[PDB]
Amino acid sequence: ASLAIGGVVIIGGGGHAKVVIESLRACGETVAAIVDADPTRAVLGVPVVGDDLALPMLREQGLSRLFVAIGDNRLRQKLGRKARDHGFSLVNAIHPSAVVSPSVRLGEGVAVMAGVAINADSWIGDLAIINTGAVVDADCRLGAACHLGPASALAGGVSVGERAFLGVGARVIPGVTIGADTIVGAGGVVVRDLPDSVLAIGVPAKIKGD
Amino acid sequence: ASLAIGGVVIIGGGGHAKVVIESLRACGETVAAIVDADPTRAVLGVPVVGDDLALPMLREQGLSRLFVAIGDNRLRQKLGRKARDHGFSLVNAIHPSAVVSPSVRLGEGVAVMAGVAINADSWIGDLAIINTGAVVDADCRLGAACHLGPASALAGGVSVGERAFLGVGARVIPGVTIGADTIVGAGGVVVRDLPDSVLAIGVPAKIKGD
Amino acid sequence: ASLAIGGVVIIGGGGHAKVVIESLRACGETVAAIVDADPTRAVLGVPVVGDDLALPMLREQGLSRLFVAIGDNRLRQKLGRKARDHGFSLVNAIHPSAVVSPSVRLGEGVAVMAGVAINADSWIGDLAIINTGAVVDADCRLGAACHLGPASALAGGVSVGERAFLGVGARVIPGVTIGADTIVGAGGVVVRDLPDSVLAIGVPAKIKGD
Numbered sequence: 001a002s003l004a005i006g007g008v009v010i011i012g013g014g015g016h017a018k019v020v021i022e023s024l025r026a027c028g029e030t031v032a033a034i035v036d037a038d039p040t041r042a043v044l045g046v047p048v049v050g051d052d053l054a055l056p057m058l059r060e061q062g063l064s065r066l067f068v069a070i071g072d073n074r075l076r077q078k079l080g081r082k083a084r085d086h087g088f089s090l091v092n093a094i095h096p097s098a099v100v101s102p103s104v105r106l107g108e109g110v111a112v113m114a115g116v117a118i119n120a121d122s123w124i125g126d127l128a129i130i131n132t133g134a135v136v137d138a139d140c141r142l143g144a145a146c147h148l149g150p151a152s153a154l155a156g157g158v159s160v161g162e163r164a165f166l167g168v169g170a171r172v173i174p175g176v177t178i179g180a181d182t183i184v185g186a187g188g189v190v191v192r193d194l195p196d197s198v199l200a201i202g203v204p205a206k207i208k209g210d
Numbered sequence: 211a212s213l214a215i216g217g218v219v220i221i222g223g224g225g226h227a228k229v230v231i232e233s234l235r236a237c238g239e240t241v242a243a244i245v246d247a248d249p250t251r252a253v254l255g256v257p258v259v260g261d262d263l264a265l266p267m268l269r270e271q272g273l274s275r276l277f278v279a280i281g282d283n284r285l286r287q288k289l290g291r292k293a294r295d296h297g298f299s300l301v302n303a304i305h306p307s308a309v310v311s312p313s314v315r316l317g318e319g320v321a322v323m324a325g326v327a328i329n330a331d332s333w334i335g336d337l338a339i340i341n342t343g344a345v346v347d348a349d350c351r352l353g354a355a356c357h358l359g360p361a362s363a364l365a366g367g368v369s370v371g372e373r374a375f376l377g378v379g380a381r382v383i384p385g386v387t388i389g390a391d392t393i394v395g396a397g398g399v400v401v402r403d404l405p406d407s408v409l410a411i412g413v414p415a416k417i418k419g420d
Numbered sequence: 421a422s423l424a425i426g427g428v429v430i431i432g433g434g435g436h437a438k439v440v441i442e443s444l445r446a447c448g449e450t451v452a453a454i455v456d457a458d459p460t461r462a463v464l465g466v467p468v469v470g471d472d473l474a475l476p477m478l479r480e481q482g483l484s485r486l487f488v489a490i491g492d493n494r495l496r497q498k499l500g501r502k503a504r505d506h507g508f509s510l511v512n513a514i515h516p517s518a519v520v521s522p523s524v525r526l527g528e529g530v531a532v533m534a535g536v537a538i539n540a541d542s543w544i545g546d547l548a549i550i551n552t553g554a555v556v557d558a559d560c561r562l563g564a565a566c567h568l569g570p571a572s573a574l575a576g577g578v579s580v581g582e583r584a585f586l587g588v589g590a591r592v593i594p595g596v597t598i599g600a601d602t603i604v605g606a607g608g609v610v611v612r613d614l615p616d617s618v619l620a621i622g623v624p625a626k627i628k629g630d
């Protein structure tokens with residue numbers, strides 16, 4: 001738990017964390033430490049210092065910036081609130097190759113991976129993930145802790161509910177609203193609104209029941 | 211109608227205009243004014259000065275560069291001809307993140323959005339839209355006023371007819387020709403030539419009649 | 421066969437070569453000559469000097485760097501071995517717009533086109549093609565001489581066998597293994613492992629027999 005001052009604490013030490021670490025370093029930021037539910041190491045050279053019980057120690061030692069690198073959307077949302085309760089500020093991890101329009105509103109704790117484009121007047125909720133190569137056209141609204149998977153695309157005016165997940169290569173046509181907690185499978189093409197809490201797959205995407 | 215000299219006039223004041231405005235500003239250009247069929251405001255800080263009846267006034271006051279920011283392909287084509295009749299030059303609106311190969315032939319009034327790649331020896335007709343994240347591989351031929359939607363992709367040697375439209379995430383395999391005025395739905399995967407004036411949807415794309 | 425010293429020899433003079441030539445020139449490299457099975461010209465200003473029988477002459481004259489610009493995966497693999505037997509080093513042709521993470525392991529003779537992203541801890545075999553706009557998420561393993569077509573995407577932890585081919589816009593969900601010599605059609609969405617030597621198409625991708 002000997003750290004250098006000033007850097008970013010990461011919650012989570014998986015594959016998603018690797019990619020976030022490399023976005024932060026590409027921006028010139030320093031990653032100080034990881035906390036992981038397996039407290040046993042290092043991720044890309046960043047030390048795993050403990051589990052979430054190490055958060056107060058990290059804060060006391062002067063570290064105050066944090067990113068939640070956990071793919072699971074509800075868990076990420078809960079951990080972001082825990083981190084803020086412990087006095088951390090949630091940074092954004094935006095790869096320098098991402099194109100984020102100057103009229104985009106960004107929340108906090110947002111991941112925006114390499115190759116992303118986000119166009120005019122889009123709003124991006126806290127703790128959203130806009131993954132590698134994803135496209136978000138103008139006037140979209142992305143709720144807190146949703147996840148646009150790699151190579152997915154939203155055409156204009158699409159709203160994505162809190163904690164919704166779009167799989168790799170999913171597509172949404174203009175004006176569509178997708179409910180909270182909804183999953184679009186990989187490659188699904190969404191051509192009408194989706195309610196909350198369903199799973200939709202196919203071209204066109206169709207809701208799959210039990 | 212008090213303007214600064216030297217900038218670009220925009221026909222259209224919708225969501226597409228927002229994105230074009232931001233491409234032009236990312237290149238260091240100034241947008242002078244919008245003309246919109248609803249002559250009532252501002253779009254991203256650009257004043258709406260009137261409807262298309264204001265074109266001659268704008269030209270007389272020394273403005274001579276124009277972009278047609280209208281998604282509808284036939285309407286865009288008609289408005290580009292009107293603009294040229296009124297003595298405007300049609301500029302291109304190419305986001306600085308777009309990769310346009312040095313052997314690409316570009317027309318005039320072309321939009322090329324953020325994250326696009328256009329490879330060797332492709333030809334891009336006047337008033338085409340190559341939207342956000344779209345890929346155009348080598349040796350493609352894009353007719354005037356066609357529209358490759360966001361995240362769409364053409365493999366090599368594909369020809370797209372005048373005013374054809376490919377929806378978000380559409381794909382075309384090598385060597386395919388798509389007729390004029392044809393629509394490929396979002397996510398459609400085109401594996402054989404399409405004639406003029408049809409609608410094709412699905413993986414693989416199939417023509418949908420009445 | 422009068423050449424300038426120091427540049428890259430290209431095997432193949434087709435559409436793929438055009439794109440590779442332009443990646444190399446975008447990096448400031450000089451392309452010295454093409455050898456093509458049709459020994460009859462120039463490709464983008466690069467002289468065709470002969471067929472593969474000209475390799476020893478080229479080496480003797482001091483040229484030692486080579487790229488194999490042949491789309492056919494098995495043929496490319498064979499030609500890369502021939503080139504190395506003749507004393508050439510196989511360079512990589514990585515467009516400057518590609519984002520290649522600093523923990524990616526790259527082989528030799530690899531093409532990485534414009535707009536590609538390759539994330540943390542991915543390994544890319546010799547003579548792989550990562551084509552225009554393709555995305556490779558973290559922890560992927562790409563075998564020698566495979567081809568990820570334009571706008572394709574691998575989510576995390578995907579393994580692609582030697583000489584496998586993914587068509588334009590193909591998608592693979594996390595953790596999937598695709599066998600050697602397997603073809604995924606354009607737009608195919610792979611949701612379970614694929615054995616060697618099959619063809620799979622559709623959303624979801626399904627193996628197509630005779």
Ligand SMILES: CC(C)(COP(=O)(O)OP(=O)(O)OC[C@H]1O[C@@H](n2cnc3c(N)ncnc32)[C@H](O)[C@@H]1OP(=O)(O)O)[C@@H](O)C(=O)NCCC(=O)NCCS
Binds near residue numbers: 131168
């Ligand atoms: C749709 C999904 C959520 C289903 O997971 P699951 O319910 O465990 O489903 P299974 O793998 O057991 O397959 C269920 C059935 O749906 C089909 N299926 C699975 N995923 C599909 C998809 N994306 N599109 C269409 N059909 C799909 C399967 O072929 C199977 O069909 P069957 O009835 O013929 O066997 C999942 O396959 C998916 O697409 N995940 C995306 C994950 C992702 O992209 N992650 C990126 C993280 S960065």
Ligand SMILES: CC(C)(COP(=O)(O)OP(=O)(O)OC[C@H]1O[C@@H](n2cnc3c(N)ncnc32)[C@H](O)[C@@H]1OP(=O)(O)O)[C@@H](O)C(=O)NCCC(=O)NCCS
Binds near residue numbers: 394
């Ligand atoms: C294909 C499209 C043009 C059809 O529009 P429409 O004819 O008004 O069709 P509807 O929304 O009434 O739906 C018609 C039927 O086709 C199906 N469908 C619609 N779009 C589909 C698509 N892209 N792929 C496959 N099926 C589709 C619907 O499920 C419906 O099926 P049903 O017979 O089971 O009800 C449209 O859905 C589309 O894909 N638009 C793309 C727009 C776009 O990407 N814009 C980006 C601008 S930058």
Ligand SMILES: CC(C)(COP(=O)(O)OP(=O)(O)OC[C@H]1O[C@@H](n2cnc3c(N)ncnc32)[C@H](O)[C@@H]1OP(=O)(O)O)[C@@H](O)C(=O)NCCC(=O)NCCS
Binds near residue numbers: 383569586587606
């Ligand atoms: C799948 C593929 C390999 C099949 O080639 P092929 O076996 O010669 O097939 P054909 O063109 O004769 O069509 C065979 C059948 O499969 C269907 N089909 C073809 N390609 C398909 C695809 N990608 N997805 C779903 N169905 C497809 C056809 O509609 C036809 O169906 P039918 O039985 O109703 O006629 C090919 O179409 C493909 O997708 N190629 C991708 C090439 C590419 O992306 N290259 C980029 C290089 S950089």
Ligand SMILES: C[C@H]1O[C@H](OP(=O)(O)OP(=O)(O)OC[C@H]2O[C@@H](n3cnc4c(=O)[nH]c(N)nc43)[C@H](O)[C@@H]2O)[C@@H](O)[C@@H](O)[C@@H]1N
Binds near residue numbers: 051
């Ligand atoms: C967006 C990505 O999300 C998922 O990636 P991921 O990195 O979140 O998932 P995994 O690789 O399983 O790693 C999650 C890591 O997160 C840790 N973890 C799991 N729960 C906790 C927790 O409560 N607190 C802390 N501090 N860490 C936790 C696990 O011990 C594990 O090391 C996967 O679904 C990927 O496919 C996807 N690309």
Ligand SMILES: C[C@H]1O[C@H](OP(=O)(O)OP(=O)(O)OC[C@H]2O[C@@H](n3cnc4c(=O)[nH]c(N)nc43)[C@H](O)[C@@H]2O)[C@@H](O)[C@@H](O)[C@@H]1N
Binds near residue numbers: 155
């Ligand atoms: C490429 C894009 O095309 C479409 O976007 P768009 O910006 O063209 O569409 P809208 O948002 O409806 O806006 C069109 C604007 O264009 C104006 N307009 C419509 N017709 C005219 C016209 O004849 N002359 C002028 N000067 N303006 C015209 C309308 O009054 C409206 O303000 C949509 O289909 C989008 O989903 C798509 N991304």
Ligand SMILES: C[C@H]1O[C@H](OP(=O)(O)OP(=O)(O)OC[C@H]2O[C@@H](n3cnc4c(=O)[nH]c(N)nc43)[C@H](O)[C@@H]2O)[C@@H](O)[C@@H](O)[C@@H]1N
Binds near residue numbers: 434499
């Ligand atoms: C990745 C790309 O692969 C394929 O492109 P390609 O450039 O390899 O294919 P083609 O345009 O037919 O050109 C292949 C060139 O490669 C030459 N060639 C074919 N065989 C040989 C060879 O053994 N030695 C040499 N030196 N050259 C060979 C042919 O004479 C021809 O000029 C196509 O499938 C494209 O659609 C795809 N984008």
Ligand SMILES: [Cl-]
Binds near residue numbers: 025029030031032
């Ligand atoms: Cl660091």
Ligand SMILES: [Cl-]
Binds near residue numbers: 235239240242
């Ligand atoms: Cl301006």
Ligand SMILES: [Cl-]
Binds near residue numbers: 449451452
């Ligand atoms: Cl050169």
Ligand code: NA
Binds near residue numbers: 115
């Ligand atoms: Na892209």
